[PDB]
DNA sequence: GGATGGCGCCCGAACAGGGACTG
DNA sequence: GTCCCTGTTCGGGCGCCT
């Protein structure tokens, strides 16, 4: 029907070949009720193991509704795949909610010369049979492309919504719409709908997001009328390392305090111009980070710390120690605590924030074992974007950096 | 006959010709077993005889099978896979048979001349070619191709596993309660049928591949049970392995070893218990095959308690999804780990073994949590659902250990069993400073040109003592001077040292480390009653970290 | 003796990432 | 920049199944 448009890779870069991994019964029950539909519809094909090219696939359960949602791991088609300004008002609406709008990629065709690197594998139970593998014929679903060649039809279909509302920003990312607007609980939902059905004329969720509470974490000193060696000692290691995101940090008066071989034990009464350091460095933690500039061309870096107790504390940079956003993230502080469970939130909130400030998915670096994450996280997992991560043994020192008292 | 299937479209990789290998002598048994299965061949069109106008050659041999009666023509293409295209192949894993459910009937048959049926694509027959001698001087020697799949090439085992699931595929949209497991070309079939109506879906499925070129010969159709599938017996109501055969030298080598190492990894599906650590510790830095190398006395005894493991008669059963899958884990010394899953008491499915060495230092928690990822990706592979532990690990052990790791661990659902030996932490770390407890400010410093350095402490009871290293590292140093802090402290003890990579470590609680000094530093923190373990940032004049530091660097740096 | 593919195990080798160090 | 230490991935051998 509608003319193709061509799109190829990266100079020197192949396709992706990448391993499917092990997927659960009810998962692949539910991609194979969903692949068969979708090439009754013409939107895959059948290939052999002729094409040397692979993405992983999963499925995902919505929180209450019996039915499945189809992802495929396309974020390293994405780094192969050859190369509108981001709002920076949706950051300040009252609600914002995100719509999957990820079935209208399937009205496009694909370019004939990339469908071949657009291919999956679904698995047998028990290797009962060997993998069936797919290739897509339509715009897939989560890859780069697929919103930018939509990009044209995209705007025709939102423009008479967004003229007959001037103050609702709708942004679009992978194949989320984010729209956030000003207006009441009540009547935001009810626009919600009219965008829906709206959506639903042409062809063919969760949950309610709110920017306006998104408060940030700043470094705290603790507050004590009886001082150690050993809380001095915890401080000036702590001071020393903030110093170095805020230069004006100094500690000078408070390591004098501890000359000599004292006792752990040993209480230590602050002097006037050590208290007064102490209090000059926490005005100087609230004051923000200075010369901090946001640079598209290059990655979003978030660390991850476990504090325990169901507390999670973040930091977004793209330089050491040029933060531009440092966050925390609590839970359940229950017995039956899955930590997994509650990374994958917390990844999943991060995420959320990064594409809403800055409109671009962040690189993790994430506090658990690459076996124990890459076992668990799907099960867990209501985002159809996935954004990259690599694993790491953070020292336990900035664990205590980014506490909470 | 030959599959009307469509021909799977192979290309080189771009710039590369076609194979020239010349023929290398065979001998004359092999020749006489050659022809005949050539003039065969090419009879059945599965070759065609080529002239002088394609250049290309490669080299052909023939093994016996294992019918050990007739003979399996092979070819030498490892020329032309160098220069074949990527595949990505199909066959994702192996069948395993406690994944197999309780069936009424019960079919084993598999497909006869399996790569000799299915085409090759025409354009690519030529890089096929292969030249075979005679009688000399009575007849010279032929040159065919591949009109089929050859046995010897890269891409022979996807194509034919893809063309087989198409075949199938039709089979089994129409019957779709009829569990067909394909590997190569064998074929489980099981039914909730009667024998008499299971026997004519039989048949069914034999018409179905006779229409697509695969015959089913009735010499490896089997009927009754025990059914030979995958190396194992299948039973009514149980499975077991084939006969495992260890090897006895004397002389063990390291091919003797690698083999006695394989037969028993593949014997612990089954046989609980199987302990193969000392038998692995040898192989290690060797450089031959034909080394020879002498068992250790730990390696005499768990080559010893293995042989008698297997001189018991033990089975499997088969998967049934509405009971609930269990999985119960066994601790073994030296980081050795066997599992058993089940769903009814003492009736497992299938055992298992964990004992992956990961991570230079590491205690028992660590290495539980590792078994407990690796059986549910395992399990899910097999059964695709999770199964319920049952851990010889406590409670309270489990909720300290994720409580204090700055690392987000955790283990799906559990329950503790009693069976010795427990996992447990041998030390713990105190979370404040110990009131009473003599305070030990340690460091250590080397040179990298000359590899000198020294490591000592400075306590805030007077004491100061330093101990001098010879090809020793800064890390090593910090190191060692935290072993100088337990040796001369008592059993409550305070340590402030400004290594984070020692006091990352420490702080794992590792009871186990390829370390020596790192297990000197394990033995000592165990028999402490209390530690305390402080960081403080290196060169920055906090004391009494000042103190020792200049005591340390004092004539190797500077 | 001389082939290929899958999966498993174990090992050593070649990387990548972070921290500390010289003057 | 270098040296050190630890991590993961890769391919070698063996085991098992045209
Ligand atoms: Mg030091």
């Not at chain 2, 020749?31 to 002088?52: D, R």
């Not at chain 2, 250790?296 to 493991?309: G, K, Q």
Request: aromatic residues 10%.
């Amino acid at each position: 029907p509608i003319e193709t448009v061509p799109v190829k890779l990266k100079p020197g870069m192949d396709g992706p070949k990448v391993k499917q991994w092990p997927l659960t019964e009810e998962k692949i029950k539910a991609l194979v009720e969903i692949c068969t539909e979708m090439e009754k519809e013409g939107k895959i094909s059948k290939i052999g193991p002729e094409n040397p090219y692979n993405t992983p696939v999963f499925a995902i359960k919505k929180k209450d509704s019996t039915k499945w949602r189809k992802l495929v791991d396309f974020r390293e088609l994405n780094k192969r795949t050859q190369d509108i300004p981001h709002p920076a008002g949706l950051k300040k609406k009252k609600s914002v909610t995100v719509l999957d709008v990820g079935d209208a990629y399937f009205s496009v065709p694909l370019d004939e010369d990339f469908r071949k690197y657009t291919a999956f594998t679904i698995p047998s139970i028990n290797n009962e049979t060997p993998g069936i593998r797919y290739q897509y014929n339509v715009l897939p679903q989560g890859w780069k492309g697929s919103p930018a060649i939509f990009q044209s039809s995209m705007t025709k279909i939102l423009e008479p919504f967004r003229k007959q509302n001037p103050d609702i920003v709708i942004y679009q990312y992978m194949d989320d719409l984010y729209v956030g607007s000003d207006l009441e609980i009540g009547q935001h939902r009810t626009k919600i709908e009219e965008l829906r059905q709206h959506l639903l004329r042409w062809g063919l969720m969760g949950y309610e997001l709110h920017p306006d509470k998104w408060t940030v974490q700043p470094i705290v000193l603790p507050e004590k009328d009886s001082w150690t060696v050993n809380d001095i000692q915890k401080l000036v290691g702590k001071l020393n390392w903030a110093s170095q995101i805020y230069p004006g940090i100094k500690v000078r008066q408070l390591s004098k305090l501890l000359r000599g071989t004292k006792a752990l034990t040993e209480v230590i009464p602050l002097t006037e111009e050590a208290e007064l350091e102490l209090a000059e460095n926490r005005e100087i933690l609230k004051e923000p980070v200075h010369g901090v500039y946001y640079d598209p061309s290059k990655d979003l870096i978030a660390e991850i710390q476990k504090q325990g107790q169901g507390q999670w504390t973040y930091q977004i940079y793209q330089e050491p120690f040029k933060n531009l956003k440092t966050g925390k993230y609590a839970r359940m502080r229950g017995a039956h605590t899955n930590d997994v469970k509650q990374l994958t939130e917390a990844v999943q909130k991060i995420t959320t924030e990064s594409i809403v400030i800055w409109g671009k998915t962040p690189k993790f670096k994430l506090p658990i074992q690459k076996e124990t994450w890459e076992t668990w996280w799907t099960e867990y997992w209501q985002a159809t974007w996935i954004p990259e991560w690599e694993f790491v043994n953070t020292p336990p020192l900035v664990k205590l950096w980014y506490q909470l008292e | 006959p030959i599959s009307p299937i469509e021909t799977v479209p192979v290309k080189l990789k771009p710039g590369m010709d076609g194979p020239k290998v010349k023929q290398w002598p065979l001998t004359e048994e092999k020749i006489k077993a050659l022809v005949e299965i050539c003039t065969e061949m090419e009879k059945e069109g599965k070759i065609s005889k080529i002239g002088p106008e394609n250049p290309y050659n490669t080299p052909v041999f023939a093994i016996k099978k294992k019918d050990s009666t007739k003979w399996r023509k092979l070819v030498d293409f490892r020329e032309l896979n160098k220069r074949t295209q990527d595949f990505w192949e199909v066959q994702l894993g192996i069948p395993h048979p406690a994944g197999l459910k309780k069936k009424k009937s019960v079919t084993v048959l598999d497909v006869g001349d399996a790569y000799f049926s299915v085409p090759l694509d025409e354009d690519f027959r030529k890089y096929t070619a292969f030249t075979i001698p005679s009688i000399n001087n009575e007849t010279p020697g032929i040159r065919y191709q591949y009109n089929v799949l050859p046995q010897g090439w890269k891409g022979s085992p996807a194509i034919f596993q893809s063309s087989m699931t198409k075949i199938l595929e039709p089979f089994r949209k129409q019957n779709p309660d009829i569990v067909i497991y394909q590997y190569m070309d064998d074929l489980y079939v099981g039914s909730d049928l009667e024998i008499g109506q299971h026997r004519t879906k039989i048949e069914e499925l034999r018409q179905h591949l006779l229409r697509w070129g695969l015959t089913t010969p009735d010499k490896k159709h089997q009927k009754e049970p025990p059914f030979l599938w995958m190396g194992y017996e299948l039973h009514p109501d149980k499975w077991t392995v084939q006969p495992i055969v260890l090897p006895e030298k004397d002389s063990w080598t390291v091919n003797d070893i690698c083999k006695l190492v394989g037969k028993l990894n593949w014997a612990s599906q089954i046989y609980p218990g199987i302990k193969v650590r000392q038998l692995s510790k040898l192989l290690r830095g060797t450089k031959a095959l034909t080394e020879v190398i002498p068992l250790t006395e730990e390696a005499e005894l768990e080559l010893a308690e293995n042989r008698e493991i297997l001189k018991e008669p033990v089975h499997g059963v088969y998967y049934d999804p509405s009971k609930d899958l269990i999985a119960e884990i066994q601790k073994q010394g030296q980081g050795q780990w066997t599992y058993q899953i089940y769903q009814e008491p003492f009736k497992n499915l299938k055992t298992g073994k964990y004992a992956r060495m990961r991570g230079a230092h590491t205690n028992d928690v660590k290495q539980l949590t590792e078994a407990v990822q690796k059986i549910t990706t395992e399990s899910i592979v097999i059964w695709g659902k999770t199964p319920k532990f049952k851990l010889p690990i406590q409670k309270e052990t489990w909720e300290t250990w994720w409580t204090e790791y700055w690392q987000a661990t955790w283990i799906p659902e559990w329950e503790f069993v009693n069976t010795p030996p427990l996992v447990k932490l041998w030390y713990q770390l105190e979370k404040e400073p110990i009131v009473g407890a003599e305070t030990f400010y340690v460091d250590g410093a080397a040179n990298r040109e000359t590899k000198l350095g020294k490591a000592g402490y400075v306590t805030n009871r007077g004491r100061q003592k330093v101990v001098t290293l010879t090809d020793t590292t800064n890390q090593k140093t910090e190191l060692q001077a935290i072993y100088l802090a337990l040796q001369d402290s008592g059993l409550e003890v305070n340590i402030v040292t400004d290594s984070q990579y020692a006091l990352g470590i420490i702080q794992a609680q590792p009871d186990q480390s390829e370390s020596e000094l790192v297990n000197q530093i394990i033995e000592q923190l165990i028999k402490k009653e209390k530690v305390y373990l402080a960081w403080v940032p290196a060169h920055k004049g906090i004391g009494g970290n000042e103190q020792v530091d200049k005591l340390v660097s004092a004539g190797i740096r500077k």
